[PDB]
């Protein structure tokens, strides 16, 4: 399931990924640089963003909320449960599973094998050495070349300033020499269009990376190290953790911002082997640049198989017209 | 240097004993590419008069200094006659280097 | 049990959620720039809002209203009795109970325990360094852009100036028009520490109840009820002088056991077509959803019930607990 | 006690200082449109002057500032360190109870000292008096107005509104329950000059309830009595008691409502309940 | 040319010592983008007037100077010759920035 | 002189303690070609301040020393007769050395 | 005047082994001064990896790093300052890059 969707969406007030600030009483919206045309020469401008690893983490927490509820999800880690980002600390060489037994960090078969959030995201054990690359890699969420050229200035972000009011058993506000913690907590609130182009290589998933493929007899197999049914398990969970994200269950402050969260349009690719990776959504003519390589993919030998939502994709191409987001899941675990 | 004049008024809304910490307006002001973006961030900054004149004697401390409608007048022909984005915001740095400064206000 | 609400409400001659001139004579409601398709391409407007911390702090205030009454409701800060917005500020290391008796604060469970204040609305403290998640998220309040394409400016904003030395004249500003809404309560983990939040017994997934059960039904259906005086006008600020004029006119809500996919925000002019496929197909997929639909047609395929007021919505709700 | 009433005036010779934009019917099209209105802080200033009249032929009308005396309705402003009572006394201004005890009208209306930074929030909500759309729609007057009296808090402090003497949740009140009694009905009886210089109540709807209620949806819209009527046929299964009175409107049938004629009654209904 | 008279009457009705403080005409002005709300905000500007020209005898000092009709007039056809927004916007702010200063508006 | 009060500011957004490593706005200060870059790279360093100023406290540390305006309004002067980049790198580098130096910071 | 010693001792953690940090081309650049302005450089660019010896020395059991003090610097700068002639330029950089090759006993 080497799955690639990108998209646009249309983020309205949020305040995801802000810059933390150091707890002073102004924080602001992370900013990053993008090129644009503008058909006079090339030119950076700064706008607000989304980082990646934000992303990530919010696909772990959709993974591990799904994956709970699978009978097979007894093989956590017991740090996953909370939703802690972390994977492995600096200098431990044990781990704890949800039921709170100990696994070993040494031959990463077994720890795939005993844990699931690191058999599907990877994890880094600096003391033992053990590593395991990442099966799903996201991307930033950039506002789109069309939006960004297009409204010619306009600085999106308004930092709204709002404040905590204390008050005492006696009903008084205080001073700074008694403290009664009061600070002003400016925040940064930003809109726009933006776009995604998350990708998921799960056909990796429960099979070591020291030996990905096992020979019998001068013949390649997947050296699938857990129950192929856990393995369908896992799988479903990594798929339907997208249904939280899409729905907008991503970036922070989600207690006071919650993003007015709608998908604009999305193509989603799912084929069996390795593909080329889908293109961003960021740029203004990807649906062409996409037509253009669905269409001829097909050609050279792929079993691409193409969902679009809101996007034409033309006619000649067999793509399915999914209407939300958790029916296109639903396609996608059809084929396991 | 008939900058230290309006820089002193603009360190005082991003400094303590006054708490105002619009940090947007100074940055937007250092942080201006075009001339019209310049004007907007000082015209924010200057909107701020009112709020501050009267709150300095309820806090006990003394009146905030304006800048001059002099030296206005000096500014709107140092930015019309800048229009090239180098000098432009060298001027819109400069306004804003010492806005964090350490001024010695409210005694 | 996890549910979702969304709809458009007519917030009609309000003062909701100000700016603050503080010392200066001028008070201004909040401004945040939204995106609008128009016809020649996005455009971004400036219109009045209400921000998301707003509308969390009122429902606060209406759940520990609707949790005085109940027989647990010594299971409170000292705070949340006055309405104290602030949970655990900088420096403090211990709770002043509703009771008096002091709550420490070295263990998530048993702050989860004592009090309820913590428990609905997430809490943080900084010097033992304890941190809970918030249960409950909102949106922001903008209008929506139905409205937003047809109004064409005019800043939908009027200034009016009331009087009073001690004699000033100060000037509010009050804003209209229909504004979209949506809330979220994922109230499933209500009594469960966020570190153990569950128990695995004898090899099989438990929740960690850590209070009495009857305890935590009470919690639920008080955070639930909480909801009543939201959509009834008991939402903003400046409510002394202004009360906001308030009606409901399109509702929707969904309302599950397990994990489920957040409804997308009323302020779309065309949610309730994304809203009619993201609510039949996630039931196809298999979750146990229950639709609630006030003042709008979703047509047939979808077992939502039609619904005339807010109220019967938390009725049926509670019932379904 | 909470309290609250909607409902519609035919008014002449408005008295603003004001007009403010409204969004009417108009379902081909939402628009906007500017109409004369009736600032929320005006009904507000009537209530408390109301409310001072009735209050000062009671035998307890002693607790009351100088400055309700001559309906100077300033409250607390900003420099004042401490208040004078209505027989001259004065009065320290660091605690709310100590408020509370010798000032009806810091009570029923809310206060702020700046100086000392104490806060009492207001126990009556007015709303605008805007024209109903069913009126506006014909023109291209009649006026709704909603009013909330949560008088449950008169005479408890803010800041300890509970005691928890063994565990259960008591009313802390710092004042004579006869006193509390007779501010209660003072403020109630204060909307006998509310609905009493042209202007006759046309449609009106109260609904009274010992504990909190939700806000009773205002009468500006044309479609307020089914809505009302569903609210309080749908709270009243919720396990709410919620006693309500009408004037010439008819909420239909299964449902159990006195019929006032008239807006003195209604008081008298309210008041003898309490 | 023609920008302190209009800047001074402007300010007349934010500075000190009045009473009409209306900031809804001085912010309107900076936040203009056409011709016709830009026209709509100076004539509501022009229009409080008569009530600082009433006002003015209330505290013995100087009346406010009026802009002359000439003056106004100069505007018609210093903005019906002017079509980007990016020039239309520069004097709409310049216009509300020179509001803010500290002289004395009356004696 | 006027570089050793910089030189011990800027040291506090790199050592021991004071959590906060910044190491974008000294590269950008040392490796500034221009007068407007150095500028920028100052604005971009002295932004920080206020952050230094509340860790102090939050630390225990003494508080940071903060530049006066004295300096900056006389470097600012100093940097604008500076028509060549051999003559600006010496300036860069000098104010970006006294950054990794052994400063008792938090004594 | 004595500083020679002090900054040659921070710069041969950039050479010696038990660091695996491997600059040599800030020490040929302090080597090579030409002028006063890259010699500055150089020695800034020296001073840049002081975070990186410093943190990973107590990685590796090590003793932390003497880092020049302030006193340190103002002596290069103010010997920097009154030399504008590269003939003495030449043996000063000489003198302190030709400490960064020594035996010192930085791990024992």
């Known amino acids: 399931m080497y799955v690639r969707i990108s998209g646009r969406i249309r983020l309205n007030a949020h305040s995801l990924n802000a810059q933390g600030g150091g707890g002073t009483n102004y924080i602001e919206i992370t900013k990053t640089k993008v090129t644009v045309r503008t058909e006079n020469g090339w030119t950076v401008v700064e706008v607000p963003a989304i980082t990646g690893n934000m992303l990530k983490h919010w696909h772990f927490v959709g993974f591990v909320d799904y994956f709970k509820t699978t009978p097979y999800g007894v093989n956590l880690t017991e740090r996953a449960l909370r939703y802690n980002g972390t994977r492995f600390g600096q200098g431990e060489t044990t781990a704890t599973k949800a039921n709170g037994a100990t696994v070993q960090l040494n031959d990463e078969a077994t720890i795939i094998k005993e844990l699931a959030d690191a058999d599907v995201h990877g994890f880094l054990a600096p003391k033992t050495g053990r590593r395991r690359v990442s099966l799903v890699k996201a991307s930033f969420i950039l506002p789109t070349e069309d939006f960004i050229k297009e409204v010619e200035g306009e600085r999106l972000i308004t930092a709204i300033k709002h404040n905590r009011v204390d008050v005492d058993e006696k009903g008084a506000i205080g001073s700074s020499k008694e403290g009664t913690a009061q600070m002003l907590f ?17 056909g990796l998933v429960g099979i070591p990376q020291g030996l990905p493929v096992k020979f019998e007899e001068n013949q390649p197999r997947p050296n699938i190290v857990i129950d192929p049914n856990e393995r369908k398990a896992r799988i479903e969970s990594a798929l339907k953790a997208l249904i939280p994200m899409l729905s907008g269950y991503i970036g922070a402050n989600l207690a006071r911002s919650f993003p007015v969260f709608k998908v604009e349009e999305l193509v989603a690719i799912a084929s069996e082997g390795p593909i080329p990776a889908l293109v961003h959504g960021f740029y203004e003519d990807y649906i062409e640049a996409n037509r253009s390589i669905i269409k001829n993919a097909r050609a050279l030998g792929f079993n691409i198989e193409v969902f679009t939502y809101n996007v034409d994709l033309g006619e000649d191409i067999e793509a399915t017209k999914v209407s939300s987001v958790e029916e296109l899941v639903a396609n996608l675990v059809k084929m396991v | 240097g008939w900058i ?58 003394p009146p905030p200094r304006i800048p001059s409608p002099e030296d206005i007048e000096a500014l709107e022909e140092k930015v019309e006659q800048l229009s090239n984005p180098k000098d432009l915001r060298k001027l819109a740095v400069s306004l804003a280097l010492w806005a964090f400064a350490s001024w010695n206000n409210c005694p």
């Open chain 2, 4 to 61: 230290r004049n309006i820089g002193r008024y603009l360190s005082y809304l991003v400094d303590d004993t006054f708490e105002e910490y619009a940090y947007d307006v100074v940055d937007g002001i250092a942080k201006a590419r075009t001339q019209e973006e310049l004007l907007e961030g000082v015209y924010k900054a200057l909107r701020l008069a009112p709020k501050l004149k009267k709150k300095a004697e309820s806090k006990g401390c």
């Open chain 1, 186 to 202: 400016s925040r940064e609130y930003a809109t726009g269009l933006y776009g995604f182009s998350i990708v998921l290589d799960l």
